[PDB]
Tab-separated table of C-alpha atoms and ligand atoms in Angstrom:
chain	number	residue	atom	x	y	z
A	1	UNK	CA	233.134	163.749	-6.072
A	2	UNK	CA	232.774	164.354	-2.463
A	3	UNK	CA	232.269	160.832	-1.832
A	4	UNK	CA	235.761	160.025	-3.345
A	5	UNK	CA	236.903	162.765	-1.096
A	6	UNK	CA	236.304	161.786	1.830
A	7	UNK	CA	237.774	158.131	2.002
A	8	UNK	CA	241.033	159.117	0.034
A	9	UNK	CA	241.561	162.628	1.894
A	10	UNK	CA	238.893	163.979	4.474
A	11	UNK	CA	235.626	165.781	3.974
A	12	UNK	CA	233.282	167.608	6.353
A	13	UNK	CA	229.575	166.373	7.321
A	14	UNK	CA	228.378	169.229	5.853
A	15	UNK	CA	229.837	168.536	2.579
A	16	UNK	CA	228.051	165.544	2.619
A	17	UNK	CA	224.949	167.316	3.245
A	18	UNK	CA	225.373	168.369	-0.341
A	19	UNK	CA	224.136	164.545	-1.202
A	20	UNK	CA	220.686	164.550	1.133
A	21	UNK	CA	217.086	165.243	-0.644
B	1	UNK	CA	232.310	168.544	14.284
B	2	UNK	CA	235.240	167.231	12.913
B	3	UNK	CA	236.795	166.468	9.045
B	4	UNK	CA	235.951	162.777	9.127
B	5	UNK	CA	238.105	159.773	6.708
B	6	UNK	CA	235.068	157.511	5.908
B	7	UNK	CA	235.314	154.795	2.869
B	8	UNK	CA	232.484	152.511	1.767
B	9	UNK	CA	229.550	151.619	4.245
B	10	UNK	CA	231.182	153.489	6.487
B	11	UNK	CA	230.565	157.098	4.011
B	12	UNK	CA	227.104	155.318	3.190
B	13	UNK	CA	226.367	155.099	7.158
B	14	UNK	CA	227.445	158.732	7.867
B	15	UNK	CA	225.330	159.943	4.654
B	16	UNK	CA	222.355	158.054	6.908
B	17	UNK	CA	223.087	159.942	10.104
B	18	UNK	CA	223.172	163.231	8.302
B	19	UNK	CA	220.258	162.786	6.235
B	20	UNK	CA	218.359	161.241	8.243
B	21	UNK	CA	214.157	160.265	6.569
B	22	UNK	CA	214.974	162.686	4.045
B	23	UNK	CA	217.039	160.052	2.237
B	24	UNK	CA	219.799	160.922	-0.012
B	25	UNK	CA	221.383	159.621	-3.343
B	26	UNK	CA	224.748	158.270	-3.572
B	27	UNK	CA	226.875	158.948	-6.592
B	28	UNK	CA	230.223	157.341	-6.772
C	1	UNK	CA	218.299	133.324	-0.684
C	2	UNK	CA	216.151	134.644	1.845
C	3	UNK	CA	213.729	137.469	2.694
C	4	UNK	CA	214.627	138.739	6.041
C	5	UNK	CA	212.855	142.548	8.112
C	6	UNK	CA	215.464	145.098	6.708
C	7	UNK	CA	215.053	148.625	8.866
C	8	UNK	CA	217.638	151.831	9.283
C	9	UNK	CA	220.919	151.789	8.661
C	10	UNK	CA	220.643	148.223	8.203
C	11	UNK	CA	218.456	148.622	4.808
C	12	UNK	CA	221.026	151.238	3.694
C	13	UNK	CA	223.331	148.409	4.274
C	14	UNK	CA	222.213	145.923	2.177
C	15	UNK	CA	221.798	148.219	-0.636
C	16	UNK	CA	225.551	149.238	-0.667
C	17	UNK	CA	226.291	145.415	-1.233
C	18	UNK	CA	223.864	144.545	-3.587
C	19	UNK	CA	224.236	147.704	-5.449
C	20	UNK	CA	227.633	148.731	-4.669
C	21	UNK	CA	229.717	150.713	-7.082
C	22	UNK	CA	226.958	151.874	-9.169
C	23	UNK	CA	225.616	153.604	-6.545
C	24	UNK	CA	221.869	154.197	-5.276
C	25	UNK	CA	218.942	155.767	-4.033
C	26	UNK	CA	217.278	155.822	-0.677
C	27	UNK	CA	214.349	157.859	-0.579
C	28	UNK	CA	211.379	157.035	2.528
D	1	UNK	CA	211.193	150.352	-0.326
D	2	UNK	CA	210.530	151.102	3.649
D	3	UNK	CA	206.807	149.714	3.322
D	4	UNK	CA	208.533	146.455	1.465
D	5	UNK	CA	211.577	145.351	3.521
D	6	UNK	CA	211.271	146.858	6.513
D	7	UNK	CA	207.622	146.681	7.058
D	8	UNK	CA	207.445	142.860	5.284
D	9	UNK	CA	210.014	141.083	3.985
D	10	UNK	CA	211.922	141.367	0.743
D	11	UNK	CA	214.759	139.169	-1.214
D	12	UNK	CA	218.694	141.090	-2.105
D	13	UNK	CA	216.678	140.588	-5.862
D	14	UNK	CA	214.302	143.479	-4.739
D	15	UNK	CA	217.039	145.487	-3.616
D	16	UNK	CA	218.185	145.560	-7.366
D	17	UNK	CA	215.406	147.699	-8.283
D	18	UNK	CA	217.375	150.892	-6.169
D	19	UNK	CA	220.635	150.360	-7.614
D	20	UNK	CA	221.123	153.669	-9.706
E	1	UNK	CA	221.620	167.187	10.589
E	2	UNK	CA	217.491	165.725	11.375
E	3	UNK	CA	216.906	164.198	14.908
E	4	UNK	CA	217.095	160.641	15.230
E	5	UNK	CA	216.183	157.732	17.575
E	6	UNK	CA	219.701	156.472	18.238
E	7	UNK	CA	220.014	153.127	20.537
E	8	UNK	CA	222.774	150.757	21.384
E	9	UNK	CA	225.498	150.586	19.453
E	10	UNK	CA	224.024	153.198	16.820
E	11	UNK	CA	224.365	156.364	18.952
E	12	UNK	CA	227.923	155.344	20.043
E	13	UNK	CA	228.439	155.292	16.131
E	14	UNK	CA	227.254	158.524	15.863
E	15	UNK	CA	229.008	159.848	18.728
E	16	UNK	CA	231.950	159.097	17.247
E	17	UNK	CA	231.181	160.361	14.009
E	18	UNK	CA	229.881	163.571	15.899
E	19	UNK	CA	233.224	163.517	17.888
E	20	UNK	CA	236.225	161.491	16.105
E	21	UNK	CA	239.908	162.070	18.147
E	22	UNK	CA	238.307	164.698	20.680
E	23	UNK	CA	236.935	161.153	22.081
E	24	UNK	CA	233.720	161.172	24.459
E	25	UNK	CA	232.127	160.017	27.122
E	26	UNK	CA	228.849	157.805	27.318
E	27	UNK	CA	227.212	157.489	30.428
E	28	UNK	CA	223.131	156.272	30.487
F	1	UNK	CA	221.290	161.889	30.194
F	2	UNK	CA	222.231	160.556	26.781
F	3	UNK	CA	219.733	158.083	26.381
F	4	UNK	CA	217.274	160.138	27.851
F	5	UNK	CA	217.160	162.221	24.958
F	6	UNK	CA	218.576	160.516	21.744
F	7	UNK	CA	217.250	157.010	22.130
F	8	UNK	CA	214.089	157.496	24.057
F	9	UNK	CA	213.055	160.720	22.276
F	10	UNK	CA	215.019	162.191	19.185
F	11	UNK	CA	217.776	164.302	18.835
F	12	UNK	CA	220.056	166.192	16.456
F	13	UNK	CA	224.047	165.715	15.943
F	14	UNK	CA	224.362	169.303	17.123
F	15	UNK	CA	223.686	167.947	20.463
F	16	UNK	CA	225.690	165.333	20.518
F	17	UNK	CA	228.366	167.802	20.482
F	18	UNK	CA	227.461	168.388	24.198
F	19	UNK	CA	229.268	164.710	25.268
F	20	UNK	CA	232.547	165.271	23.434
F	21	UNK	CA	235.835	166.208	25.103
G	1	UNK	CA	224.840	141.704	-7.836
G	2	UNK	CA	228.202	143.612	-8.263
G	3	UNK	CA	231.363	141.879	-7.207
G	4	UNK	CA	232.314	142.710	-3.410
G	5	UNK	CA	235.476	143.570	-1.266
G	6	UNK	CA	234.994	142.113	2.583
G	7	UNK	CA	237.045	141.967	5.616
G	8	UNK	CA	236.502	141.435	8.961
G	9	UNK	CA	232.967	142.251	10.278
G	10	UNK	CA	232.174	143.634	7.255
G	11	UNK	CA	232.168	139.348	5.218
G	12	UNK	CA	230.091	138.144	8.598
G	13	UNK	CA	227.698	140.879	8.260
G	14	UNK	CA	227.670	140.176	4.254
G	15	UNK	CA	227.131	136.306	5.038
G	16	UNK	CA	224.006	137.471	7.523
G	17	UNK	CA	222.323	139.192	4.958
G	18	UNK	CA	222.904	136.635	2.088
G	19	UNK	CA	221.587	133.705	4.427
G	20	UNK	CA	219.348	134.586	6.863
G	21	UNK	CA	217.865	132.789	9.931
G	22	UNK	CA	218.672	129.731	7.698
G	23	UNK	CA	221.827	130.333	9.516
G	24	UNK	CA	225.462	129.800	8.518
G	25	UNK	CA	229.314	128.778	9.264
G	26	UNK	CA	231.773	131.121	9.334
G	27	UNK	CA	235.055	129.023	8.591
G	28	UNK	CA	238.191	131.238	7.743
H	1	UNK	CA	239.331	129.920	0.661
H	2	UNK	CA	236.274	131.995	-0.864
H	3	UNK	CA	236.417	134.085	2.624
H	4	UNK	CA	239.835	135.191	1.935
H	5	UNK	CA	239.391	135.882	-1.737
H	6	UNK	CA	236.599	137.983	-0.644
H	7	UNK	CA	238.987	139.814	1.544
H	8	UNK	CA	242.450	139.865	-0.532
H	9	UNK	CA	240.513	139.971	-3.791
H	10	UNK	CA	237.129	139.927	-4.201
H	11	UNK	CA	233.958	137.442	-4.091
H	12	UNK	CA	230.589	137.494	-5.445
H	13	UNK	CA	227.390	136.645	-3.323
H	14	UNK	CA	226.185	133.976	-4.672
H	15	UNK	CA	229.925	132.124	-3.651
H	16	UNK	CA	229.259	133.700	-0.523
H	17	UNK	CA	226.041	131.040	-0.963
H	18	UNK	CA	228.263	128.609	-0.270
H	19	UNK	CA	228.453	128.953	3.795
H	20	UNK	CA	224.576	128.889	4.561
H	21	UNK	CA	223.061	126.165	6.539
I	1	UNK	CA	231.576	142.321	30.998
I	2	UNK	CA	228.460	142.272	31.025
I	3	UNK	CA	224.809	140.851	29.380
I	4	UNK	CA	222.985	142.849	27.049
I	5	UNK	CA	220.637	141.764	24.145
I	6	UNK	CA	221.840	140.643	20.793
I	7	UNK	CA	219.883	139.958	18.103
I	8	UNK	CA	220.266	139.726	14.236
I	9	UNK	CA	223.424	141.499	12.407
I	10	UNK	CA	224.408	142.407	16.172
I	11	UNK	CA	224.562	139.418	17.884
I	12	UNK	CA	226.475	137.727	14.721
I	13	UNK	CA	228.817	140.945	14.960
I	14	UNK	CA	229.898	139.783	19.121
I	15	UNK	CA	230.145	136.382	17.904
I	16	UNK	CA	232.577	138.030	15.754
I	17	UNK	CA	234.518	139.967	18.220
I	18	UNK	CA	234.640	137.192	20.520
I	19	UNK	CA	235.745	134.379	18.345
I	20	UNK	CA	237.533	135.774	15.871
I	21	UNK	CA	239.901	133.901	13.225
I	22	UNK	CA	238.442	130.385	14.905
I	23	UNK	CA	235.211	131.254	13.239
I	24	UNK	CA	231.350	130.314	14.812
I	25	UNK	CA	228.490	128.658	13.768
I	26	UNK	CA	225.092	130.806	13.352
I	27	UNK	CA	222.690	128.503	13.656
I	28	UNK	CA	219.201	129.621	14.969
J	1	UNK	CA	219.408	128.252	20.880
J	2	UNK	CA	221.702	130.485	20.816
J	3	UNK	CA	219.187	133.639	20.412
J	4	UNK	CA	217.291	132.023	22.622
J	5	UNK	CA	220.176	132.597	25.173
J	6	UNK	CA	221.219	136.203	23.752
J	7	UNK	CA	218.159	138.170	21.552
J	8	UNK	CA	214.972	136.969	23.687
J	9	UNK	CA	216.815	136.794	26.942
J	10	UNK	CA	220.644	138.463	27.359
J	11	UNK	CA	223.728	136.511	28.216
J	12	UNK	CA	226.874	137.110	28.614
J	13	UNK	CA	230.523	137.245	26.062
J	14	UNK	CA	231.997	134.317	27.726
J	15	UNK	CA	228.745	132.143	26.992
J	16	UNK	CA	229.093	132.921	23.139
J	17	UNK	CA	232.438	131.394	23.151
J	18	UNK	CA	230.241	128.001	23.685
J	19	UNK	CA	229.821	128.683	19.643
J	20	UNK	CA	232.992	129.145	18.253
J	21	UNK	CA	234.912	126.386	16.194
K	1	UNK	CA	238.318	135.071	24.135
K	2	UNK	CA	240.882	136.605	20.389
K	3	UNK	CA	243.267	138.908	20.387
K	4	UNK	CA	241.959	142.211	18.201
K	5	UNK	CA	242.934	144.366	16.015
K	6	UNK	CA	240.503	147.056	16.213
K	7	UNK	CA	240.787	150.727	14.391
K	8	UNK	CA	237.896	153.552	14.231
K	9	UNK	CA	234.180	153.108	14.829
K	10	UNK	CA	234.923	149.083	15.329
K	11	UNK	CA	236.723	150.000	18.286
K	12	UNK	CA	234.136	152.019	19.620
K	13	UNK	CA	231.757	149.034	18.674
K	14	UNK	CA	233.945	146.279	20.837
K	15	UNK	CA	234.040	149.356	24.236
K	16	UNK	CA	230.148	149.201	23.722
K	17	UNK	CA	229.795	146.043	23.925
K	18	UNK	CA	232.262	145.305	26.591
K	19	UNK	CA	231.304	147.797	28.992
K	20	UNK	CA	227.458	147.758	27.811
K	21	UNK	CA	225.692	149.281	30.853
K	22	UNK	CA	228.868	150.954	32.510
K	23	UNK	CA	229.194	153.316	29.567
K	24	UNK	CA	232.611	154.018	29.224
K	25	UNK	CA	235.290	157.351	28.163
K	26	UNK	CA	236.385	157.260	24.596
K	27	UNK	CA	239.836	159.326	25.110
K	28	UNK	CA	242.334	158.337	22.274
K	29	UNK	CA	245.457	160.061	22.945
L	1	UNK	CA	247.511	154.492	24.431
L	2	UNK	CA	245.886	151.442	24.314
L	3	UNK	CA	243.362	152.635	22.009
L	4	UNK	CA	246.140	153.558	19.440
L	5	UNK	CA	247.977	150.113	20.524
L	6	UNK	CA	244.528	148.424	19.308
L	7	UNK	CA	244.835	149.719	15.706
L	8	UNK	CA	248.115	149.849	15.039
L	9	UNK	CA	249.278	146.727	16.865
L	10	UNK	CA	246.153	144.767	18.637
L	11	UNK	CA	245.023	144.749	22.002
L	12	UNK	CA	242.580	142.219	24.184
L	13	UNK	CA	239.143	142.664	25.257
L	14	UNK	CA	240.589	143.152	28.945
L	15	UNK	CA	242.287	146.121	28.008
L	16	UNK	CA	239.872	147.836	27.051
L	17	UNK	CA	238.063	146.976	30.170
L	18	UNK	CA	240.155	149.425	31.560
L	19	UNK	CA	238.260	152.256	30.001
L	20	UNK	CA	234.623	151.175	30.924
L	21	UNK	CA	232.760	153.073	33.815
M	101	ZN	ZN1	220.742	147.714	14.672
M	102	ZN	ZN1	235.179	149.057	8.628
């Protein structure tokens, strides 16, 4: 998942805009 | 903006910033 | 323990220690 | 949530309910 | 990417999350 | 200023763009 | 409560949470 | 001692317990 | 340096920064 | 006392030290 | 007052609360 | 950089005095 992503590679803000309501 | 490295609170503390009051779910 | 005033990314905090791994759900 | 630890007070116990 | 009220040490947080290695400047 | 518009009043991360380098 | 992994700022902030204005001693 | 296993291993809270006043 | 107002997670978080490995007592 | 000498009313770095072990 | 060992938004944490008032420049080279 | 001396080595808290305003 993105969340794994981003702390062992790098992920955008928008990409975690994927997890808001 | 730039391709962030965030792990743990951190990620859970940037979710809050980009959500905001509409909340959000986190699914590890 | 104690009951303490929990607001912000403080609240979103706490839940990723008490809840950690298995995730959660902050919805205002 | 907001209205019970924020707004009053609430124990980590509470904070078990949100875990997913 | 909802606005905020960001104080102290919480919009410095999100300035860097905003900004990362392009650094920035915070002046009141 | 910075303050003057995030703290005091609200603002989005798109403007916080306007204080990087 | 799930098991936790805390360094630095992150164990003081853990040990803030867990026992409130009851106060505590932070002895590493 | 439970401070360091909390940081080279891990620790539950209620060991954490252990440091309040 | 300079004085600003610490309360809470924040002002155990300078005790932090300014102590260190010694450790501190929190004791309101 | 010691948010009596930082949260109500501010102090300064050096005066926390007068809490560290 | 330690010696630190400070790496990513901690860093920016300490600068905040070092220069408080003053503000300060973030430039990592 | 004393910023990147701070995270990969360490640094004081008068160093990064340096970079206040
Ligand atoms: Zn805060
Ligand atoms: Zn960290």
């Amino acid at each position: 998942g993105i969340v794994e992503q981003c702390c062992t590679s790098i992920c955008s803000l928008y990409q975690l805009e994927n997890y808001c309501n | 903006f730039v391709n962030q490295h965030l792990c743990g609170s951190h990620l859970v503390e940037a979710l809050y910033l980009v959500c905001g009051e509409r909340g959000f779910f986190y699914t590890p």
